[PDB]
Amino acid sequence: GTSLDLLRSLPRVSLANLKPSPNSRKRERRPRDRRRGRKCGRGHKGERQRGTRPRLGFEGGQTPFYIRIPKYGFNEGHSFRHQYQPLSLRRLQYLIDLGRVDPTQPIDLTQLVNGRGVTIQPLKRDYGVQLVEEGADTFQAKINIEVQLASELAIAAIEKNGGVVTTAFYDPRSLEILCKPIPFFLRGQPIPKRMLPPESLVPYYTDAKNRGYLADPAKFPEARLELAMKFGYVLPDITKDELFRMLSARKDPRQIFFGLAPGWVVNMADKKILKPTDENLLKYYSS
Amino acid sequence: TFQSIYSLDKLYPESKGADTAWKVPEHAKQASSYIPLDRLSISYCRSVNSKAEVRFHLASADWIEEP
Amino acid sequence: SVTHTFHQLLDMREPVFEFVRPPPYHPKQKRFPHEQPLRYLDRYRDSHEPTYGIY
Amino acid sequence: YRAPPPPRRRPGPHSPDPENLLTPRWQLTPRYVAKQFGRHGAISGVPPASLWPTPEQLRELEAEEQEW
Amino acid sequence: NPGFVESVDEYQFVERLLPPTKIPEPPKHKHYPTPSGWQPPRDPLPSLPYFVRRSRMHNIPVYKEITHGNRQMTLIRKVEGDIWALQKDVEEFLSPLLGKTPITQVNEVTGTLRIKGYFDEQLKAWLLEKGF
Amino acid sequence: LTYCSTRKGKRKTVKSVVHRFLRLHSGLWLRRKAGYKKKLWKKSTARKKRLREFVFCSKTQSKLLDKMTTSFWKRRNWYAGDPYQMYHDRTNLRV
Ligand SMILES: [Mg+2]
Ligand SMILES: [Mg+2]
Ligand SMILES: [Mg+2]
C-alpha cells in the first residue's frame, strides 16, 4: 500500500535507527532520590520496616480463619477420579464441514486428535472422550464413531441419520499409545495388549442400551428400535446401504489399531512389520 | 483379521451372524401402541425453548379404535 | 356452550386466558455472595440444562 | 570472509563404549539398544529376535497379570 | 532359523496413523450455507477500498475481548487497504442501533479496529453480506 | 509459606487449605460451618438447620486462599457425573 512507498523516501534502516514499540517498557525506579529515598517507602521504625513481619495467614495470635473451619472431604480422592473430555455435536459437525475429519473412514480418538478436534492429557487423568447432546437438532452426517462414553440423546441423533456409535474402554497405558502412536513405534517395542475394564465399569460396557463393546450383539436390534419409537423417527436399515462394511467395522476387544495385532513390531525406517514365530509368544499375545 | 479369546464370536457363540445387530426388528408394528408417524403432522416453532406442536384429525384417524 | 358460540355463529377461534402472577423479587446479583448457601446461584439462572461452550 | 559449515546432527546408530568409566549409564541399558533399531531399522545391527521377551521374562509377565 | 517373519503388506494401516502438519483446504459443497453455518468467501471479490482476510482456520476474524473485568470490546483484525474507510462504514452501520456514534480505536501499525461494546454477531453477518 | 523451595525452586501449597475448602472454577470458595457436629443436643432445630449448609466466602478470604494454593488446584476438571457441574460458571452477572 501507500506505507511501503514511504520507505523509499526515508533513510536506510540500520542498527543505529532501531526503536521499540511505544509504551512497551516501563521505567524502573531506584531509591537514590528524595522522592524514593530516605525511608524508601517502608515507613517508620518497626517490625515491618526491618523486614520481619509474620507469615501469610497469621492473625496476631488468635486462631486463624483457615484453621478454625472444620475439615471436610471436598477433595478426597480427587487424584483418582476419572476424567472425560466433552465433544459436542456442534464441534463435530463443524470439523466435518471444513474437511479436518474424513467421514468416509471410521472415526476414533486417533483421527480426532490428528485433526486438532480434541486435546487429550493422559498425565492429567484423561481417559477419553464423551459425546454431548448439544447441537443435536442440526446434526446431518452419516459416520462411524467410537467414543468412551455417550448420552441417550447423543446416540439417537447419530443413528437417526443412519450411523453407528459404540462405546469402548482404554486403559491408561493403551490410551497414551493411541493418542501419540508414532513416538511409540520409534521405541522399538512390540505392541502391547489391551486390558479389560475394571470391575466397577464392567456393567456399563456389557449393556446393550449403552452400545457397549462387550454387550451381546443379538440384543442391539431391540434397543435401537426403542429409541426410534421414543424420539419419533423411523429406524433406517443400513445393510442396504453401499457402505455397510465401513459402518460395521469394529476392532477386537484386545486390539488398539484397526489393522495391527498385539505383539508386532513396526520398523518405520524401511517400511516393514515383524511378527514373532514362537508358540509361547503367540499364545501369550492371542490370550 | 486378528481374533482373541475375548472376541465377540467366542463370548457370544449363538449370535455369530455378521449382521445380527443391524437387522431391523421384524414385527413390532403392534408393539407399545405403535403410533404411525405419517398420520401425524409435526411442526417446529422457535417459540429460550424451541416449541414443538403435533396435530392430527381425531375422527378421521383410524389407528385408534372407535370406542 | 361458550365454545359453540365462538365457533358456530361468531365464527372465530376461541381465546383462552390465564392468571399470571408477577415474577419474584431478588436483590441484585453479587460477585461474592458472602455467607449465602449454595442455592444462591440457582435463583439467577434461566435454563436448567447444562451448556458446554466451545467444547 | 566465508562462514564455517553449518552445524549438523551426527547421523547413524550410536554404540557407546562399555569399558569407559565416564560413559553415562543410561546409554548402556537394553532400552537404549532397542531405540537404535526403532530409529534406524536394520542398519543398527540389533538382532531382531532380542526385541521380544525372553522365556524367563515371559513367566514373570504372566504371573503378574493373573495377580492383578 | 530366525524367530521373526517380515511382511510389507500391512504397512498401509501405519500410513493412516501419520498426522498432518498443514491445515486442509475446506471441501466444496453443493449447497451453502453448510449445515454448521460456515460459508466460503464469495467470487468475485468485492471492489471496496478495504479488504478483510480470513484466518488460517477459514473464519471471519472478529473477536470479543474484555479488560479490567468490566470493559467489553470487539475487534476486527486482518484489514488491508484503507483502515479509515472501514471506520466510517462501521459508524454508519452501527449508529442507528445504539442511538449514538460508537466509540472506536484505529491501529494503523497492526491494521486492527477496536469498538467499545459487544457487537460480534452483527459485524460477522455484516461482513458476510459484503462478501469478504 | 514457601515462595522458593530448595529442590525445585517453586511455590508450595498449604495443605490445610485443601482439606477444608472447595474452589469453583469461576473463583468462589465453599466451606462448612464451625461447630456443625458439636453439642447438637443443646441447639435448637432452626440453629441446627443453618449449620448443615454449604456457604460461600468473602472477597478478602477468597484472595488469601488463592495465594496459599498453586495453579494445579485452579484448573478445569471434567468429572463424569459431577454433582457440581452446574456451579462452575456464572450467568446474568453484571459487575
Ligand atoms: Mg529494583
Ligand atoms: Mg485438558
Ligand atoms: Mg459472618
Curated annotation (Swiss-Prot), chain A:
Transit sequence range: 1-12
Transmembrane segments: none
MF annotations from Gene Ontology: structural constituent of ribosome
Pfam families found in the cross-reference section: Ribosomal_L27A
Region (Disordered): 13-59
Composition skew (Basic residues), residue ranges: 24-43
GO CC annotation: mitochondrial inner membrane; mitochondrial large ribosomal subunit; mitochondrion
GO biological process: cellular response to leukemia inhibitory factor; mitochondrial genome maintenance; mitochondrial translation; translation
Keyword match Iron-sulfur: no
Subunit structure: Component of the mitochondrial ribosome large subunit (39S) which comprises a 16S rRNA and about 50 distinct proteins.
Record family assignment: Belongs to the universal ribosomal protein uL15 family.
HAMAP family (alphabetical): Ribosomal_uL15
Name of the molecule in the record: Large ribosomal subunit protein uL15m
Source organism (scientific name): Mus musculus
Curated annotation (Swiss-Prot), chain B:
GO biological process: mitochondrial translation; mitochondrial translational termination; rescue of stalled ribosome
Keyword annotations: Hydrolase, Methylation, Mitochondrion, Protein biosynthesis, Ribonucleoprotein, Ribosomal protein, Transit peptide
Membrane-spanning intervals of the chain: none
Compartments, record wording: Mitochondrion
Disulfide cysteine pairs (residue numbers): none
Any Gene Ontology CC annotation: mitochondrial large ribosomal subunit
PTM comment text: Methylation of glutamine in the GGQ triplet by HEMK1.
One GO MF term attached to the UniProt entry: peptidyl-tRNA hydrolase activity
Keyword Hydrolase included in the entry's annotation: yes
Family statement drawn from the similarity comment of this UniProt entry: Belongs to the prokaryotic/mitochondrial release factor family. Mitochondrion-specific ribosomal protein mL62 subfamily.
Function of the protein: Essential peptidyl-tRNA hydrolase component of the mitochondrial large ribosomal subunit. Acts as a codon-independent translation release factor that has lost all stop codon specificity and directs the termination of translation in mitochondrion, possibly in case of abortive elongation. May be involved in the hydrolysis of peptidyl-tRNAs that have been prematurely terminated and thus in the recycling of stalled mitochondrial ribosomes.
Record note on quaternary structure: Component of the mitochondrial ribosome large subunit (39S) which comprises a 16S rRNA and about 50 distinct proteins.
Protein name: Large ribosomal subunit protein mL62
From Swiss-Prot, chain C:
Source organism superkingdom: Eukaryota
Localization per record: Mitochondrion
Family: Belongs to the phosphatidylethanolamine-binding protein family. Mitochondrion-specific ribosomal protein mL38 subfamily.
Assembly notes: Component of the mitochondrial ribosome large subunit (39S) which comprises a 16S rRNA and about 50 distinct proteins.
Protein name per the record: Large ribosomal subunit protein mL38
Protein source organism: Mus musculus
Gene: Mrpl38
Entire protein: shown range: 326 to 380 of 380
UniProtKB/Swiss-Prot annotation, chain D:
Family listed: Belongs to the mitochondrion-specific ribosomal protein mL64 family.
Quaternary structure and interacting proteins, as annotated: Component of the mitochondrial ribosome large subunit (39S) which comprises a 16S rRNA and about 50 distinct proteins. Interacts with GADD45A, GADD45B and GADD45G. Interacts with NR4A1 via the NR4A1 AB domain. Interacts with ATAD3A and ATAD3B.
General function of this protein: Acts as a negative regulator of G1 to S cell cycle phase progression by inhibiting cyclin-dependent kinases. Inhibitory effects are additive with GADD45 proteins but also occur in the absence of GADD45 proteins. Acts as a repressor of the orphan nuclear receptor NR4A1 by inhibiting AB domain-mediated transcriptional activity. May be involved in the hormone-mediated regulation of NR4A1 transcriptional activity. May play a role in mitochondrial protein synthesis.
Species the sequence originates in: Mus musculus
Localization: Mitochondrion; Nucleus
Listed name of the protein: Large ribosomal subunit protein mL64
Membrane-spanning ranges: none
Disulfide bond sites: none
Part of the full-length chain shown: 25 to 92 of 222
Region (Disordered): 1-23
